[PDB]
Design a protein around this ligand. Structure first.
Ligand SMILES: [Zn+2]
Ligand SMILES: [Zn+2]
Ligand SMILES: [Zn+2]
Ligand SMILES: [Zn+2]
Ligand SMILES: [Zn+2]
Lengths: 77, 319
């Protein structure tokens, strides 16, 4: 049932993540926070130019296997 | 020595609670708001009997059901955050600088001044969530307290702390829809898989995080395909009433001598890895109006790290 998507960091390196479309992006964000050394309040994710909201399931965004999600540094101004 | 109050979530459906003068609201019922004020840690008395109070915690199923109809699929924490953020922001003020409305600096709220002033130029959007649209309509009428607090609560912003204006601006727009037509057609292809057209409509065709200029949006992109090869993607049609592009802070020299295409943009001051400052800018009458949280100054040239860039309408077709 789970599938594999890619999250890419500011440096350009993609990593694989096994996820389910019923998981929330808050759950994916904690997997991403685990692989790199960054905490959830320091970044936000985009797919196809649009942000991913924390409390919504991944299936709301049309992710297919090896879809590439981008990590964006959460600025503090 | 007993009072009866009416708790509500929507101001239309009420439910009574009998309370005593011995314990406080929080122990008997939960956190409650009376005329915008938290009274959860006060002991009830006669001046509350008969009046309605807005319950924030410990909601029942039927009040939760009404909560989701008014604010959308929100999380149990939401209502407390919203009510508390609204009372904390009460002191903030919107000040008119050069015939427009801007938000004065208080408690690191400059990222919000960028968000709200960029939204104020989008004059063809509405929100699908009722509470949000009501707050948005009130903000456009004068009182912005509700609208400020709501986008703070929807954006998971902590009070008095700096945040990311592009994050919040695009998060808020994901809750909005467009009152006119808009269309964006991507052409994807892979030498092994084939060619496919992806079509986006409405407000979703007017925002994109990842590029900051219309040339870079229309450029051909290349990424790994599900087969293992390299898939390509390129814009082939675009018609919008405006276009909002956001990226990381990118140093540019914006000048009015070459008459730029964009109508407005946001600037980050400082370095990305530390706490910086946001400034909103519009172009009017051959000058750049800089809006630094309740103050305004004009310049002809500015070296600055831009983030969000708002363009006018897009009429494009290629290939
Ligand atoms: Zn409570
Ligand atoms: Zn409370
Ligand atoms: Zn392929
Ligand atoms: Zn490749
Ligand atoms: Zn290649």
């Amino acid at each position: 049932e789970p599938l594999s998507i890619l999250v890419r960091n500011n440096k350009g390196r993609s990593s694989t993540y096994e996820v389910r479309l019923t998981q929330t992006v808050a759950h994916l964000k904690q997997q991403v926070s685990g692989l790199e050394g960054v905490q959830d309040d320091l970044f936000w994710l985009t797919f196809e130019g649009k942000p991913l909201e924390d409390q919504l399931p991944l299936g709301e965004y049309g992710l297919k296997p090896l879809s590439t999600v981008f990590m964006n540094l959460r600025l503090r101004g | 020595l007993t009072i009866e109050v009416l708790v509500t979530v929507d101001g239309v459906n009420f439910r009574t609670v009998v309370l005593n003068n011995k314990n406080t609201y929080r122990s008997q019922l939960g956190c409650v708001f009376f005329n915008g004020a938290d009274i959860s840690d006060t002991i009830p008395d006669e001046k509350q009997n008969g009046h309605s109070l807005y319950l924030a915690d410990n909601l029942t199923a039927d009040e939760t059901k009404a909560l989701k109809e008014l604010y959308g699929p929100v999380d149990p924490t939401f209502l407390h955050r919203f009510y508390s953020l609204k009372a904390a922001v009460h002191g903030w003020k919107m000040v008119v600088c050069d015939k427009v409305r801007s938000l004065k600096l208080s408690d690191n709220n400059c990222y919000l001044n960028a968000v709200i002033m960029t939204l104020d130029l989008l004059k063809d959007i509405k929100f699908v969530i009722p509470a949000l649209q009501h707050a948005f309509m009130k903000h456009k009428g004068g009182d912005s307290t509700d609208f400020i607090a709501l986008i703070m609560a929807y954006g998971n912003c902590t009070f008095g702390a700096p945040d990311d204006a592009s994050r919040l601006l695009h998060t808020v727009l994901a809750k909005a829809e467009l009152c006119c037509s808009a269309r964006m057609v991507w052409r994807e292809w892979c030498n092994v898989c084939g060619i496919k057209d992806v079509v986006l409509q409405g407000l979703k065709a007017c925002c994109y995080v990842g590029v900051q200029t219309v040339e870079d949006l229309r450029a051909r992109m290349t990424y790994v395909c599900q087969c293992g090869g390299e898939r390509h993607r390129q814009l082939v049609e675009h018609t919008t009433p405006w276009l909002l592009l956001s990226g990381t802070p990118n140093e540019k020299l914006v000048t009015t001598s070459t008459a730029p295409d964009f109508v407005a943009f946001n600037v980050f001051q400082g370095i990305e890895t530390a706490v910086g400052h946001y400034v909103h800018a519009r172009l009017k009458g051959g000058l750049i109006l800089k809006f630094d949280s309740g103050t305004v100054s004009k310049t002809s040239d500015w070296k600055c790290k831009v983030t969000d860039v708002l363009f006018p309408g897009q009429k494009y077709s290629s290939d």
